Amino acid sequence: MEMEKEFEQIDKSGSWAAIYQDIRHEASDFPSRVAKLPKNKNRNRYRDVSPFDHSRIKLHQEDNDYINASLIKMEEAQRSYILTQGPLPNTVGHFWEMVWEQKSRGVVMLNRVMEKGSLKCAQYWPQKEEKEMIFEDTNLKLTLISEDIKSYYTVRQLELENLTTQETREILHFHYTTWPDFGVPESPASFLNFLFKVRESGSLSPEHGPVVVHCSAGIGRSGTFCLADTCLLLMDKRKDPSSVDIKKVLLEMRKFRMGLIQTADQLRFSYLAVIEGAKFIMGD
Numbered sequence: 151m152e153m154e155k156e157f158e159q160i161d162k163s164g165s166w167a168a169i170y171q172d173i174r175h176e177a178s179d180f181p182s183r184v185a186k187l188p189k190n191k192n193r194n195r196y197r198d199v200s201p202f203d204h205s206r207i208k209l210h211q212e213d214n215d216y217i218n219a220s221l222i223k224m225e226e227a228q229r230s231y232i233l234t235q236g237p238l239p240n241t242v243g244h245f246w247e248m249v250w251e252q253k254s255r256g257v258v259m260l261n262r263v264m265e266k267g268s269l270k271c272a273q274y275w276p277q278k279e280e281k282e283m284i285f286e287d288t289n290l291k292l293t294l295i296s297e298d299i300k301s302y303y304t305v306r307q308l309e310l311e312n313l314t315t316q317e318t319r320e321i322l323h324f325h326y327t328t329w330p331d332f333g334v335p336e337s338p339a340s341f342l343n344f345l346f347k348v349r350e351s352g353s354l355s356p357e358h359g360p361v362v363v364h365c366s367a368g369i370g371r372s373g374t375f376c377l378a379d380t381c382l383l384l385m386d387k388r389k390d391p392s393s394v395d396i397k398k399v400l401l402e403m404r405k406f407r408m409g410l411i412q413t414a415d416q417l418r419f420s421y422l423a424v425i426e427g428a429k430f431i432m433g434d
């Protein structure tokens with residue numbers, strides 16, 4: 151089934167929980183042996199969210215190449231994304247190693263450091279220009295260069311440097327700060343706007359390494375971001391709404407990382423965002 155008639159038709163029954171639960175049953179299940187090894191226990195923020203072994207990103211440090219991060223490769227769209235958990239205090243360093251290795255231009259953050267009174271992520275970036283960060287055991291220094299704080303999001307320009315070698319890179323930090331503590335936003339417009347900024351930056355483009363995307367577990371809000379982006383690009387490819395099938399795209403994405411889209415409320419919101427973002431895409 152166009153997706154908005156289908157939307158209308160799901161919305162007037164209440165098959166969302168119904169549809170969601172169906173995706174869950176048919177999703178891929180692949181092994182995660184590396185994530186589960188003893189030595190790696192302290193590198194996982196959550197027990198039940200692990201990267202599969204076939205798509206996990208691997209550090210270049212022979213010693214322990216483990217990070218909770220997955221490469222989501224979308225062949226047709228010529229899009230790749232790295233989805234990862236919010237860094238722990240002890241993996242902060244790992245996180246910036248990955249970025250550097252993979253040649254990413256942008257980092258997309260969809261959570262706040264504290265939510266519902268608890269801590270969801272380490273503070274992995276510098277808050278003032280004059281107070282730069284150096285990691286342990288990593289040989290990297292991160293410097294805040296500038297920020298631009300708006301009402302729904304904040305964009306930071308950052309400088310990442312290799313101390314061993316002296317190489318410098320500009321990294322852009324796209325931080326969506328207004329996702330509510332419970333549920334999903336009322337309107338997707340702010341989220342669509344944020345997506346487009348990221349896209350306008352060059353961060354999602356093929357000439358660079360994959361964008362690094364994360365929330366607390368790196369599957370829910372993060373899945374919403376990558377799903378909508380891809381569905382819309384597919385929409386530009388051949389200018390055709392009915393041709394793009396969101397459910398099938400979501401299952402394909404779930405071959406690379408487990409659990410993408412955590413609630414049925416998040417699936418409805420994904421649907422919402424695409425239908426509406428689709429009224430850019432088709433020439434308006």
Ligand SMILES: COc1ccc(CN)cc1OC
Pocket residue numbers: 226227228356383387
């Ligand atoms: C940049 O190049 C492309 C990127 C994406 C698509 C996606 N269908 C096609 C492209 O060819 C030009």
